[PDB]
Design a protein around this ligand. Structure first.
Ligand code: HAS
Ligand code: HEM
Ligand SMILES: CCCCCCCC/C=C/CCCCCCCC(=O)OC[C@H](O)CO
Ligand SMILES: CCCCCCCC/C=C\CCCCCCCC(=O)OC[C@H](O)CO
Ligand SMILES: CCCCCCCC/C=C\CCCCCCCC(=O)OC[C@H](O)CO
Ligand SMILES: CCCCCCCC/C=C\CCCCCCCC(=O)OC[C@H](O)CO
Ligand SMILES: CCCCCCCC/C=C\CCCCCCCC(=O)OC[C@H](O)CO
Ligand SMILES: CCCCCCCC/C=C\CCCCCCCC(=O)OC[C@H](O)CO
Ligand SMILES: CCCCCCCC/C=C\CCCCCCCC(=O)OC[C@H](O)CO
Ligand SMILES: CCCCCCCC/C=C\CCCCCCCC(=O)OC[C@H](O)CO
Ligand SMILES: CCCCCCCC/C=C\CCCCCCCC(=O)OC[C@H](O)CO
Ligand SMILES: CCCCCCCC/C=C\CCCCCCCC(=O)OC[C@H](O)CO
Ligand SMILES: CCCCCCCC/C=C\CCCCCCCC(=O)OC[C@H](O)CO
Ligand SMILES: CCCCCCCC/C=C\CCCCCCCC(=O)OC[C@H](O)CO
Ligand SMILES: CCCCCCCC/C=C\CCCCCCCC(=O)OC[C@H](O)CO
Ligand SMILES: CCCCCCCC/C=C\CCCCCCCC(=O)OC[C@H](O)CO
Ligand SMILES: CCCCCCCC/C=C\CCCCCCCC(=O)OC[C@H](O)CO
Ligand code: CUA
Ligand SMILES: [O-][O-]
Ligand SMILES: [Cu+2]
Lengths: 166, 31, 529
């Protein structure tokens, strides 16, 4: 009775532990895969790149929004997004479809989310740091930007826009 | 054999896999 | 027994905290149902200035205060009762009082709209010193619990050389040691930055360092919440179901593994942070998938125990055992119900942990959906159900049949409402709805969310009734028996495993923290509420 049940459960538990361990490992392999594709561009470059939030709106690449979209290669654009209470500059961000877009996002106040609806772009913006992420737009049109990190009372209404030209 | 325990851990594996392959699919769709 | 009085004080304060924080629950849920009830809330509770002050209170009171108090009750009293020994009473009251004093002190600025930062309090969002000082003194209370339990262990170990540590005590020792390690992350954040900054000593704080230190402490905190439910599930629930614990070794191994793996995983909250090397994020990714192992193990060990109870009580078939279990006992129902919702909850967890997959869901309604299954349901439910054995044992007072039935009602409504709410938020987050957001205030922003929104409203009402009922209600320990000595002996070499646990932290945070401390960039604070 009880000796038999204990032997059988453990026997089956050992098997489940082997199965679930393999399941986890397969997931690990499947993540390793994502890491080698273009789709991994949305992981922030791991690089520290300090900036001063008190002057970032008065000198340097973020202080002229209309000149924030720069061509940096034959099929590559860098965009110096500013994320602030409570909006983004530029509004809108205009970029061509099929070009690689390197987003360099910083804040001058408090942390902000930068989440491009319909895409894997989903990065924190820290005052003092530049968050760098890459993405290629595959469909032309209007994407919206949502702030997904609580930034104060204007949070729920903090939106921006990206336009990807056909 | 602990048939009951097995049913539970089968449901668990189904839930994990559905969620996991679910969102993995979503990741590529938005990729 | 003076340990009962101390324990009761801890539980009571924790449940008060639960009721008060939970009051904002329904309102938030309606909010995620695109219905705005904050004019009604502001009339009732006129000190509340905003959704976000509401959100702060909810989070801090429910997820820091109640859960901690519940751990200090369970994971001191239970070992004390297993050993049949007294805790150091002076220390036990000291712990209570720090909890109580730190709480009062944080509550002030909180109630006065002076610290509307969330439970996460990320700089540069700058709160009142009393919040940080109060929160600090609050958490440090646990350091006293840690000691107390280590004390009991040693005193017993003296009386009993060459005996393995009994199970519950084993659980609590690995638990409290784990927590000492995890807690350092916050101690480090408060002392080196939060306190200096909030008192006016330094002019800035580096947001990246503060989050890194925060999340050293911020993950194992959830395990610190869970493990008290676990201890009960393992060593009590089986008697409650009419069965027995099926493996004492396996339970120890679960807990051991949490001690090893609870802390070195924090970057899984920082997949979207700049300036963390991606290789590190992968490392913490695998380590996180590792930490799911003890739960996978717990899923099996526990189910087996329930089946066992179910067959003992004469249920036959593949599902027969399920209907043979005591669905009339709220102390059994609550944890089992929470176990069920823990299935999709952990499923979401495993999703969040996989590095790239987190980009889909990070900072959406998905996350709150995931964790209401975890803490708001399994933990809270387990807590609610212990009332039905824990109260009598502590108070002398018996539970009526009426109170029993009202308890079955509360737990069921709380579970169902939680499940409904979990469908709403998971789905809403798949539709890109942000978390932590007074969305009902931008009614036309998320039209595609119309359906999951109905779920969210329904849940708000179901959970309001359950809360209301729980309030209306609120006004020997059934340790189970157990059915490979050497493994057991290996797991009893505690200082060793403790040492290892520490190395794993140094190894997982050392290189990244050194890097960051070498390049600090403090930035001015802000109050945007
Ligand atoms: C108590 C509270 C919590 C637990 C436990 C919990 C578990 C997990 N979490 Fe989590 N979660 C994450 C990963 C996981 C992983 C891998 C697990 C795992 O431990 C899960 C293991 C569980 C299982 C593998 C399921 C086992 C099932 C069992 C044991 C039940 C079986 C049934 C039985 C036996 C009954 C059957 C009986 C019958 C009668 C039929 C990550 C990232 O990787 C994020 C960040 C995402 C982001 O972008 O912010 C996160 C964020 C959160 C936050 C939000 C923090 C914030 O405010 O920003 C909270 C509070 C939270 C709480 C909790 N979390 N989590
Ligand atoms: C009366 C039932 C309750 C309801 C209906 C409920 C409702 C909610 C909802 C709708 C949110 C999301 C709000 C937002 O993200 O803007 C939320 C957040 C949260 N709740 Fe609850 N919940 C309840 C009880 C609890 C319990 C008992 C806990 C913990 C034990 C708790 C922990 C959390 C945490 C920590 C937050 C996140 C706050 C933040 O982002 O800073 N919930 N809840
Ligand atoms: C134990 C009890 C658990 C809870 C079970 C009760 C469920 C709520 C009632 C539903 C009936 C239909 C109600 C729908 C009719 C009113 C809806 C309406 O008019 O909408 C309100 C407005 O849009 C917003 O401000
Ligand atoms: C697409 C991938 C497939 C997904 C579909 C889900 C598969 C079911 C999951 C786990 C089975 C767990 C049971 C494993 C235990 C094996 C049995 C065992 O241990 O057998 C020894 C026993 O003593 C007799 O000889
Ligand atoms: C119980 C849970 C039930 C859950 C129900 C599952 C719903 C999943 C929905 C969407 C995921 C896919 C997102 C794919 C994003 C593509 C968006 C797109 O192509 O359009 C936007 C663009 O801006 C136009 O110009
Ligand atoms: C007890 C109830 C608790 C609540 C449980 C929460 C429910 C969420 C479950 C699964 C999400 C699976 C991910 C969705 C997968 C559908 C999308 C898909 O198939 O992906 C390709 C498509 O083109 C993309 O738009
Ligand atoms: C007994 C043997 C059991 C072994 C079990 C192994 C499980 C499957 C593993 C890997 C498949 C990896 C392929 C990943 C497919 C996704 C690619 C994709 O979704 O699309 C392309 C994207 O746009 C980028 O170019
Ligand atoms: C702030 C300071 C209040 C601290 C007051 C602390 C009062 C201690 C209460 C307590 O539990 O101490 C028992 C005492 O020895 C006799 O009853
Ligand atoms: C309970 C614990 C409370 C800890 C409070 C203060 C710690 C003392 C910190 C010492 C003060 C540091 C001031 C300093 O030297 O700051 C450098 C400044 O950033 C460059 O100008
Ligand atoms: C003993 C308990 C508390 C000591 C009280 C601490 C008193 C410290 C007051 C400093 C202060 O109020 O500085 C805040 C200022 O607004 C900078 O932002
Ligand atoms: C037991 C613990 C096991 C720990 C060992 C786990 C394996 C991690 C190794 C390499 C990750 C690869 C990192 C590559 C990151 C690329 C990101 C990128 O391309 O960003 C733009
Ligand atoms: C969308 C969210 C809503 C979905 C909600 C569904 C979730 C599962 C609900 C209940 C599971 C309960 C499992 C077993 C039921 C126990 C009752 C039973 O078996 O009764 C015994 C009998 O009365 C002699 O004691
Ligand atoms: C289908 C649409 C969804 C509608 C929403 C459901 C919500 C409330 C209904 C009331 C449910 C209350 C459940 C109480 C169960 C109970 O008390 O059962 C004890 C049982 O004997 C073993 O524990
Ligand atoms: C014992 C308790 C058991 C717990 C287990 C219960 C959890 C259910 C899991 C997943 C449901 C998701 C449903 C599958 C998703 C369908 C996807 C779909 O229809 O796609 C939408 C489309 O992409 C855009 O409109
Ligand atoms: C109990 C049985 C199960 C089901 C029966 C009760 C469930 C209905 C509850 C509330 C709906 C009433 C309010 C619904 C309105 C909010 C959600 C909605 O439709 O919002 C989108 C729209 O754009 C907004 O302007
Ligand atoms: C688990 C319990 C069942 C929950 C909800 C009932 C389902 C009702 C869902 C119907 C939503 C109707 C709605 O608001 O429609 C969306 C949109 O406006 C199109 O016209
Ligand atoms: C110093 C804090 C304790 C560090 C780890 C506890 C294990 C230990 O040192 O154990 C000695 C025990 O008293 C022998 O029976
Ligand atoms: Cu910016 Cu929320
Ligand atoms: O914390 O997961
Ligand atoms: Cu975590």
């Amino acid at each position: 009775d009880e000796h038999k049940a204990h032997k059988a459960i453990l026997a089956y538990e050992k098997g489940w532990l082997a199965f679930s361990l393999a399941m986890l490992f397969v997931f690990i392999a499947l993540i390793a895969y994502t890491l080698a594709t273009h789709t991994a561009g949305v992981i922030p470059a791991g690089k520290l790149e300090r900036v001063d939030p008190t002057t970032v709106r008065q000198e340097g690449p973020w202080a002229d929004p209309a000149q924030a979209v720069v061509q940096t290669g034959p099929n590559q654009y860098t965009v110096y997004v500013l994320a602030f209470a409570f909006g983004y500059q530029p509004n809108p961000i205009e970029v061509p479809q099929g070009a690689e877009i390197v987003f360099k996002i910083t804040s001058p106040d408090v942390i902000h989310g930068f989440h491009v609806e319909g895409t894997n772009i989903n990065v924190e913006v820290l005052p003092g740091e530049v968050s760098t992420v890459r993405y290629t737009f595959k469909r032309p049109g209007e994407y919206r930007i949502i702030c997904n990190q609580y930034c104060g009372l204007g949070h729920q209404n903090m939106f921006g826009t990206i336009v990807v030209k056909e | 054999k602990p048939k009951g325990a097995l049913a539970v851990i089968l449901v668990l594996t189904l839930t994990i896999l559905v969620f996991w392959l679910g969102v993995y699919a979503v990741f590529f769709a938005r990729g | 027994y003076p340990e009962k009085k101390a324990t009761l004080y801890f539980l009571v304060l924790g449940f008060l905290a639960l009721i008060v924080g939970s009051l904002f629950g329904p309102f938030q849920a309606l909010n995620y149902g695109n219905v705005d009830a904050y004019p009604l809330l502001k009339r009732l509770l006129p000190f509340v200035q905003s959704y976000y002050q509401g959100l702060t209170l909810h989070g801090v009171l429910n997820a820091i205060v109640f859960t901690q108090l519940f751990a200090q009750a369970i994971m001191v009293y239970l070992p004390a009762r297993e050993l049949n020994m007294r805790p150091n009473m002076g220390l036990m009251w000291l712990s209570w009082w720090m909890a109580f004093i730190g709480l009062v002190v944080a509550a002030l600025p909180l109630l006065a709209n002076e610290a509307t930062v969330l439970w996460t309090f990320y700089p540069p969002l700058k709160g009142h010193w009393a919040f940080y000082l109060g929160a600090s003194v609050f958490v440090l209370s646990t350091w006293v619990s840690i000691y107390i339990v280590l004390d009991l262990w040693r005193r017993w170990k003296a009386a009993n050389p060459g005996k393995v540590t009994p199970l519950v005590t084993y659980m609590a020792v690995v638990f409290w040691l784990m927590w000492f390690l995890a807690s350092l992350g916050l101690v480090l954040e408060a002392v080196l930055f939060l306190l200096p900054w909030s008192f006016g000593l330094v002019e800035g704080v580096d947001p990246l360092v503060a989050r890194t230190l925060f999340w050293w402490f911020g993950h194992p905190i959830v395990y610190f919440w869970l493990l008290p439910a676990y201890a009960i599930i393992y060593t009590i629930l089986p008697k409650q179901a009419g069965g027995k614990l099926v493996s004492d070794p396996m339970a120890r191994l679960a807990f051991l593994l949490f001690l090893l793996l609870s802390t070195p995983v924090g970057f899984h909250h920082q997949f979207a942070d700049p300036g963390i090397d991606p290789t590190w994020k992968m490392i913490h990714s695998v380590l996180t998938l590792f930490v799911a192992v003890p739960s996978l193990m717990t899923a099996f060990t526990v189910a087996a125990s329930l089946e066992f109870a179910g067959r003992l009580r004469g249920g036959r078939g593949l599902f027969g055992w399920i209907r043979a279990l005591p669905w009339d006992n709220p102390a059994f129902v609550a944890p089992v119900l929470g176990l069920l919702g823990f299935i999709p909850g952990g499923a979401g967890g495993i999703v969040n942990a996989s590095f790239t997959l987190d980009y889909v869901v990070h900072n959406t309604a998905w996350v709150p959906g995931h964790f209401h299954l975890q803490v708001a349901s399994l933990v809270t439910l387990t807590a609610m159900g212990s009332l039905y054995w824990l109260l009598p044992n502590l108070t002398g007072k018996p539970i009526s049949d009426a109170q029993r039935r009202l308890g079955l009602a509360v737990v069921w409504l709380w579970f169902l409402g939680m499940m409904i709410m979990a469908v709403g938020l998971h789905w809403a987050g798949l539709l890109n709805v942000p978390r932590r957001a007074y969305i009902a205030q931008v009614p036309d922003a998320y039209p595609h969310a119309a359906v999951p929104m109905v779920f969210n409203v329904l849940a708000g009402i179901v959970l309001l009734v359950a809360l209301l009922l729980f309030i209306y209600g609120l006004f020997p320990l059934p340790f189970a028996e157990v059915i490979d000595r050497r493994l057991v002996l290996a797991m009893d070499r505690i200082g060793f495993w403790f040492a290892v646990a520490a190395i794993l932290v140094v190894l997982a945070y050392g290189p990244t923290l050194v890097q960051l401390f070498g390049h600090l960039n403090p930035v001015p604070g802000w109050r945007l509420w």
